[PDB]
Ligand binder design. Structure first.
Ligand SMILES: OC[C@H]1O[C@H](O[C@H]2[C@H](O)[C@@H](O)[C@@H](O[C@H]3[C@H](O)[C@@H](O)[C@@H](O)O[C@@H]3CO)O[C@@H]2CO)[C@H](O)[C@@H](O)[C@@H]1O
Ligand SMILES: OC[C@H]1O[C@H](O[C@H]2[C@H](O)[C@@H](O)[C@@H](O[C@H]3[C@H](O)[C@@H](O)[C@@H](O)O[C@@H]3CO)O[C@@H]2CO)[C@H](O)[C@@H](O)[C@@H]1O
Ligand SMILES: OC[C@H]1O[C@H](O[C@H]2[C@H](O)[C@@H](O)[C@@H](O)O[C@@H]2CO)[C@H](O)[C@@H](O)[C@@H]1O
Ligand SMILES: [Ca+2]
Ligand SMILES: [Ca+2]
Ligand SMILES: [Ca+2]
Ligand SMILES: [Ca+2]
Ligand SMILES: [Ca+2]
Length: 1052
C-alpha cells in the first residue's frame, strides 16, 4: 500500500552554495505554502560570534543591538546570509533573529565537519541545523503534540484524522518513529478506518465524545503495541503525510488490563511463611526486583514474572527477606522523553522506607514489635455511628512542628516529632488535654504521610534554633547572600531574626528576606507534596531509617486517643503527586506506568497543574484502587478515625463514594469529608463538590458562614482586606474608615450566618433581611445557592484554617480604629461562637484559642517555625514579628502598615482570657443534644430564629432550639428549649421575645462569673433579656414535671 513519507513534492531547492572561505545560512520560510507576493525580510538578521569552540567567522557582529546583518538575498522560500570566513575548516556560532528577538532559542553551532559544503538551513524555533532547505522543510512535518487518544481496544479518537484518506497508527518497539534517510515511514502500523464513537467511550470520556473516531481491526495485538511508542499519522490520497502526533493510552490500558489487575494485591506482601512482591506495569518491557543490604549494596537482582492478563509483575521469596530494602528496575517507554527509559524506582505500595525515601522496605505491619503496648485494644473515644454522634465532632486542625517546635517544656529530642504528644508534663500536651476535657473531640493532622519537601537526612538540614554557621554550611544561597556576614558569628538563626525585627518594615522586609532563604533547608513544610501515599513521614520520627517511624507514629495515635481522649483525622492528598516525568527524584508513579496516573492536557499530553503541582487521575481504575488500598492501611493498621480529602473536588463523585463503601467494610463508622469547591473538571466527570454530594453523607467545608463572619474572601488584596468587614468584625454596626458596606449588605451576611448555624441546609426555611420567606437554597452566596446540604453532618463550618489569614489577623485588618484590644478578643470569640454553637460540624485552626497570628502571612506553607509559631508558654500570639513573605503578600504591605499598630499585641492576660472563652464555647456545644441534632428534618422541626426582617437590630443573632411538645419527644430532660444569642455589636441589646417564659442562663456560663462571654447579661423579672456589647449568651427553659410548651418553630 501507499508508503507514507515526508513532503518531497514542491520541496524548496538551494538558494545558493557557499563559495571560497564563506558559509551561507538559509531561513526556510514555511509561509511559502502559498506565496503570492514578496514578503519583507528586511528587519531580519543574524547574531555572529567566533570564540572558543568555534572561531571561523571573519569579522563578526559587534553588540547584540546590531541589526545590520540583513539577508544577502531571498526568494519565495525565504532569505539567506552569505557569511565571510577565514578558513573553510572548524565551525561558527550563529543566532537567527528578527530585529532583536531570538527567532530561535539556541546557540546554533554550524560545524564544517558535519556540513562540508558549509551551506545549511534553519527554521523558526526548531533548534536544529540541516544541510538543506529541503530537510528543514520536511522537518516541519515531523511528530508534534499528542492529541490522539487510544481509549479502548478498537477505538482511536483523533482530530487530525478527519477527511485525510490515509489514517494510520504506527509503532516501534525500541525506537522512535520518524522517517528513514529516504524520508519515508517504514515502521509497521495498523490501518485505521472512520467510525462512530460508541456509547461506552462517550460515557467514559464525555470531554472527547466529539472527537473524530477511528476503528482498529479485532486481530490487533494491543499488548505488543503498548510495549513501545505509538504514533498516529494522517496522509492524503497520494500518501503524503499532513500530521503525526503521539498517543495517550490511559484509556486502552484500563479497557485491556484494569479488571484483571484490580483482582490482585500489590506491594511487598510479607507473611511469616514467605513474601510475594507485585507491581502493576502493563507497558514495561522488563522489570527486575533489586534487593539491597542495610548499607545499600546490591545483594541480588531478580527478573520478575509478568502476568499477561493483568500486566502486573511478581516475584515470590522466603520470609528471610523481612526487613530488606528494595527497588524495581524498570525498562519502560516514557512518552514525554520518547525513549525506553531504564531506572530504579521505589514501590508505589511501599509500607516502609529508608531515610529520605530512597529505598522501599519489606514489612509486616501486623508485627508486634511495630506496635506499642496494648495497641490492638485501642478504642475510639468518640462515637461516629449516628448523625447525632457525628454532629458532635469538634475539630482542632494541627501540624507536627506547629505543636512542639517552640515548646521548651517538651524534651529537646522530641520537638517537632510524633512523640512530643507523649510528653504529658509539657505545656503543649497539658493544653490539649484541657481542650479535650472542655469539648474539643478530634485532632486533624496536616500531612503525616510521606511528603517530599523536607530532607530527612539530618546533616543536610538547619533549623532556626541552631547556629547560623550550620545554616551557611548546608545552604549555599545564604552563603552568597547579603546575610553572609553572619556565617562566622556566634549567633543562632533565631537570634539573628529577632535582632532584625526593630528595623523591619514595608520599606525593609529583612525578616522575611532571611527567612525565605532559611525555608529552603529547614525541617518545615505543611507537606501537601506526596512522595509515598502509605508510609508515615520520616522527618517527624526520631530515626527515619527503616521501620522505626511506624511504631512511633502508632505510639502518637495511641496517646491522642487513650491519653488525650480525642479521635484522629488524617489529611490526605490523592489529588496530585509531587512530580511526574522520567527524571525527577520524587516521580514514582509516572515512572512505572508513564502517562497513566496523571491527568493530561487533551492536546499536548502535558501533565496538568491546576491543583498546584502534578495533577493525578482518580478517574482511572488502577489509581482509584491505589487510593482505596491506601486508605485501608491507614484505617486498619494505623487506626485512623476519619479522613479529610485535600481538593476532593478534583475526584469523581463516584470514586469517593466507592472508596467509602470499601472502607466502611473495615470500619463501619469511618467519616469522609473534604474540599468540595469547583475543580473545573465537570466536563470529564461528575465531580465531588458541595452541590453534587448532597444527601450522600460525605461532608464538605462550607465557605458560606466562613466568609460572612470573617468578612470578604480568600482572594482579597490591598484595601479590600480592610474594606470587607464581616459579622465578627462589625460589618455595618462598627464601620472602619474605608468600608462602604451598606446596612443591607451587612444584613445579607447575617442571613448567611444564621443559615450556617442551622447547618446550611438547602431546604431550611427562614425570614431574610427583607422579611421574605426563603429556603436556604434561595439565599445567595456570590451568585450561587447558599444552602446546599441535606443534613448538617454534610457541612463543616469554620472561621479559620491553615489556609489563608488567621482569624486574628483578619480582625486586625478589618476592625475599626476605635475597637480596643479587649473588644478584639471578644470579636474573636463572637466569631468562633457562630461555629461552635451551630448545627454543622465544627472545625477550627490550632491556636484560635490563643488568638494565633502569622504576622499577616496569607499562605504560610513554607514560612517555617518563625511565622507559624504557637507559644504554649502564653507570652504572645506571634503577631507583629516582621512583614510577611513579599512574594505573596507584598501587595498588602501598604494596608498592613496602616492597620498593624492600632492596638497592643496580645500578651498572657489576653491569651488566658481567650482560652477561657473558647473552652466555654466548646463546653456549651456538648452540654445538650439540642446543639447537635444531626438529622436535617429534625433541624427543620426544631430550629428557628428571632430578630429577623427589615426591622431587625443589626448584628444580633438569636437562634432558638425547640424541645417542646410540638417538636416531638423531649431530647433533653433538663430543658424544654434553648436560646442562643450572639450580640455582635457595640450597643447593649434588649430581647422582648421571651417575656414571661422563665429563661435562665446556662449553669456553665454562670460558673464562669465575670470571665464569661455572658458577663453582664441580665434576665429581668418581666422576662426580658439584655445583652452587653460583643457578648454571647445561652439561655434555657428549665423542664418541669413533664415536657413543656418550649419554643415552637413559627409556621411561615
Ligand atoms: O513547589 C510546589 C508548589 O508549592 C506551592 O503550592 C502549595 C501551596 O502554596 C499551599 O498553600 C498548599 O496548597 C494546598 C492547600 O493548603 C490545601 O488546603 C488544599 O487547598 O490543597 C492545596 C494544594 O495541595 O500546598 C501547595 C503544594 O505544596 C506553590 O504555590 C506552587 O506554585 C508550587 O507548585
Ligand atoms: O492549590 C494551590 C493553592 O492552595 C491554596 O488555595 C486554596 C484557598 O486557600 C482555599 O480557600 C480554597 O479556595 C476556594 C474558596 O475557599 C472557595 O470559597 C471558592 O472560591 O473556591 C476556591 C477554590 O477555587 O482552595 C484553594 C485551593 O487552591 C493557597 O491559598 C493558594 O495560595 C495556592 O495557590
Ligand atoms: O557575547 C556573546 C554571547 O552571545 C549570546 O548571548 C547573548 C544572549 O543570547 C542575548 O539574550 C543577550 O544577552 O546578549 C548576549 C550576548 O551579548 C550567546 O548565547 C553566548 O553564548 C555568547 O557568549
Ligand atoms: Ca548543504
Ligand atoms: Ca519524606
Ligand atoms: Ca521549608
Ligand atoms: Ca480540562
Ligand atoms: Ca426536654
Amino acid at each position: 500500500d501507499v508508503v507514507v513519507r515526508l513532503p518531497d513534492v514542491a520541496v524548496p531547492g538551494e538558494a545558493v552554495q557557499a563559495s571560497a572561505r564563506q558559509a551561507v545560512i538559509h531561513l526556510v520560510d514555511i509561509a511559502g505554502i502559498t506565496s503570492s507576493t514578496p514578503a519583507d525580510y528586511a528587519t531580519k538578521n543574524l547574531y555572529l560570534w567566533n570564540n572558543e569552540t568555534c572561531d571561523a567567522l571573519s569579522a563578526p557582529v559587534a553588540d547584540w543591538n546590531d541589526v545590520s546583518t540583513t539577508p544577502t538575498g531571498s526568494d519565495k522560500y525565504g532569505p539567506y546570509w552569505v557569511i565571510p570566513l577565514t578558513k573553510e575548516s572548524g565551525c561558527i556560532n550563529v543566532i537567527v533573529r528578527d530585529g532583536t528577538n531570538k527567532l530561535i532559542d539556541s546557540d546554533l553551532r554550524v560545524s564544517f565537519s558535519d556540513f562540508t559544503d558549509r551551506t545549511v538551513s534553519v527554521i523558526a524555533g526548531n533548534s536544529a541545523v540541516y544541510d538543506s532547505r529541503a530537510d528543514a522543510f520536511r522537518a516541519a512535518f515531523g511528530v508534534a503534540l499528542a492529541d490522539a487518544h487510544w481509549v479502548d481496544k478498537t477505538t482511536l479518537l483523533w482530530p487530525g484524522g478527519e477527511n485525510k484518506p490515509i489514517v494510520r497508527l504506527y509503532y516501534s518497539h525500541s525506537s522512535k518513529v520518524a522517517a528513514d534517510s529516504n524520508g519515508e515511514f517504514s515502521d509497521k502500523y495498523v490501518k485505521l478506518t472512520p467510525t462512530t464513537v460508541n456509547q461506552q467511550v462517550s460515557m467514559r470520556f464525555p470531554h472527547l465524545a466529539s472527537y473524530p473516531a477511528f476503528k482498529l481491526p479485532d486481530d490487533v495485538n494491543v499488548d505488543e503495541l503498548l510495549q513501545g511508542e505509538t504514533v498516529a499519522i494522517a496522509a492524503e490520497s497520494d500518501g503524503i503525510l499532513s500530521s503525526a502526533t503521539q498517543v495517550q493510552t490511559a484509556g486502552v490500558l484500563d479497557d485491556t488490563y484494569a479488571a484483571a489487575a484490580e483482582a490482585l494485591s500489590y506491594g511487598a506482601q510479607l507473611t511469616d511463611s514467605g513474601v510475594t512482591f507485585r507491581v502493576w506495569a502493563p507497558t514495561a518491557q522488563q522489570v527486575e526486583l533489586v534487593i539491597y543490604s542495610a548499607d545499600k549494596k546490591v545483594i541480588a537482582s531478580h527478573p520478575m514474572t509478568r502476568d499477561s492478563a493483568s500486566g502486573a509483575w511478581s516475584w515470590q521469596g522466603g520470609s528471610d527477606l523481612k526487613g530488606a530494602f528494595y527497588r524495581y528496575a524498570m525498562t519502560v517507554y516514557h512518552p514525554q522523553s520518547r525513549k525506553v527509559e531504564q531506572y530504579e524506582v521505589t514501590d508505589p505500595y511501599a509500607h516502609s522506607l529508608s531515610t529520605n525515601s530512597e529505598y522501599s522496605q519489606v514489612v509486616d505491619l501486623n508485627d508486634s514489635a511495630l506496635k506499642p503496648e496494648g495497641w490492638d485494644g485501642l478504642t475510639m473515644p468518640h462515637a461516629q455511628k449516628t448523625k447525632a454522634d457525628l454532629a458532635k465532632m469538634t475539630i482542632h486542625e494541627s501540624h507536627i512542628r506547629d505543636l512542639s517546635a517552640w515548646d521548651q517544656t517538651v524534651p529537646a529530642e522530641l520537638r517537632g516529632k510524633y512523640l512530643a504528644l507523649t510528653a504529658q508534663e509539657s505545656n503543649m500536651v497539658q493544653h490539649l488535654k484541657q481542650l479535650s476535657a472542655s469539648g474539643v473531640t478530634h485532632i486533624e493532622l496536616l500531612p503525616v504521610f510521606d511528603l517530599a519537601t523536607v530532607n530527612e537526612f539530618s546533616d543536610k538540614v538547619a533549623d532556626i534554633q541552631q547556629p547560623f554557621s550550620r545554616l551557611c554550611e548546608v545552604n549555599s544561597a545564604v552563603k552568597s547572600s547579603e546575610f553572609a556576614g553572619y556565617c562566622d558569628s556566634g549567633s543562632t538563626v533565631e537570634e539573628v531574626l529577632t535582632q532584625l525585627k526593630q528595623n523591619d518594615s514595608k520599606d525593609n522586609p529583612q525578616v522575611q528576606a532571611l527567612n525565605t532563604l532559611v525555608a529552603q533547608t529547614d525541617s518545615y513544610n505543611w507537606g501537601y507534596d506526596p512522595f509515598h501515599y502509605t508510609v508515615p513521614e520520616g522527618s517527624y520520627a526520631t530515626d527515619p531509617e527503616g521501620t522505626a517511624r511506624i511504631k512511633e507514629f502508632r505510639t502518637m495515635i495511641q496517646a491522642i486517643k487513650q491519653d488525650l481522649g480525642m479521635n484522629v483525622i488524617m489529611d490526605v492528598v490523592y489529588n496530585h503527586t509531587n512530580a511526574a516525568g522520567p527524571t525527577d527524584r520524587t516521580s514514582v508513579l509516572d515512572k512505572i506506568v508513564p502517562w497513566y496516573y496523571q491527568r493530561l492536557n487533551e492536546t499536548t499530553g502535558s501533565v496538568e497543574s491546576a491543583t498546584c503541582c502534578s495533577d493525578s487521575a482518580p478517574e482511572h481504575r488502577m489509581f482509584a484502587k491505589l487510593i482505596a488500598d491506601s486508605l485501608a492501611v491507614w484505617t486498619t493498621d494505623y487506626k485512623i478515625d476519619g479522613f479529610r480529602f485535600d481538593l476532593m473536588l478534583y475526584h469523581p463523585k463516584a470514586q469517593i463514594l466507592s472508596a467509602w463503601e470499601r472502607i466502611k467494610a473495615l470500619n463501619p463508622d469511618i467519616y469522609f469529608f473534604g474540599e468540595g469547591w469547583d475543580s473545573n473538571q465537570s466536563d470529564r466527570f461528575e465531580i465531588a463538590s458541595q452541590i453534587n454530594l448532597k444527601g450522600t453523607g460525605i461532608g464538605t467545608f462550607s465557605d458560606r458562614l466562613r466568609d460572612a463572619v470573617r468578612g470578604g474572601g480568600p482572594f482579597d488584596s490591598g484595601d479590600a482586606l480592610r474594606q470587607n468587614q464581616g459579622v465578627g468584625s462589625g460589618a455595618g454596626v462598627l464601620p472602619n474608615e474605608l468600608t462602604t458596606l451598606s446596612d443591607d449588605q451587612a444584613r445579607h451576611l447575617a442571613d448567611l450566618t444564621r443559615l450556617g448555624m442551622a447547618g446550611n441546609l438547602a431546604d431550611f426555611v427562614l425570614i431574610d433581611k427583607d422579611g421574605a420567606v426563603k429556603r436556604g437554597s434561595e439565599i445567595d452566596y456570590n451568585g450561587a445557592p447558599g444552602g446546599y446540604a441535606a443534613d448538617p453532618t454534610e457541612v463543616v463550618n469554620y472561621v479559620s484554617k491553615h489556609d489563608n489569614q488567621t482569624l486574628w489577623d483578619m480582625i486586625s485588618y478589618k476592625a475599626a480604629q476605635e475597637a480596643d484590644l479587649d473588644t478584639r478578643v471578644r470579636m474573636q470569640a463572637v466569631s468562633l461562637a457562630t461555629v461552635m454553637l451551630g448545627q454543622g460540624i465544627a472545625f477550627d485552626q490550632q491556636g484560635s484559642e490563643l488568638l494565633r497570628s502569622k504576622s499577616f502571612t496569607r499562605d504560610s506553607y513554607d514560612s517555617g517555625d518563625w511565622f507559624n509559631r504557637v507559644d504554649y508558654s502564653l507570652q504572645d500570639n506571634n503577631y507583629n514579628v516582621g512583614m510577611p513573605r513579599s512574594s505573596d503578600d507584598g501587595s498588602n504591605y501598604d494596608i498592613i502598615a496602616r492597620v498593624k499598630d492600632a492596638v497592643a499585641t496580645p500578651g498572657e492576660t489576653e491569651l488566658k482570657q481567650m482560652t477561657a472563652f473558647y473552652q466555654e464555647l466548646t463546653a456549651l456545644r456538648k452540654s445538650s443534644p439540642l446543639f447537635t441534632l444531626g438529622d436535617g428534618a429534625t433541624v427543620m422541626k426544631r430550629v428557628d430564629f428571632r430578630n429577623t426582617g427589615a426591622d431587625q437590630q443589626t448584628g444580633l443573632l438569636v437562634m432558638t432550639i425547640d424541645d417542646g411538645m410540638q417538636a416531638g419527644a423531649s431530647l433533653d430532660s433538663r430543658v424544654d428549649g434553648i436560646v442562643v444569642a450572639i450580640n455582635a455589636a457595640p450597643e447593649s441589646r434588649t430581647l422582648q421575645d421571651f417575656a414571661g417564659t422563665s429563661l435562665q442562663l446556662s449553669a456553665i456560663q454562670q460558673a464562669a462569673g465575670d470571665r464569661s462571654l455572658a458577663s453582664g447579661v441580665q434576665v429581668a423579672a418581666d422576662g426580658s433579656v439584655t445583652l452587653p456589647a460583643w457578648s454571647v449568651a445561652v439561655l434555657e427553659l428549665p423542664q418541669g414535671e413533664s415536657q413543656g410548651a418550649g419554643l415552637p418553630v413559627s409556621s411561615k
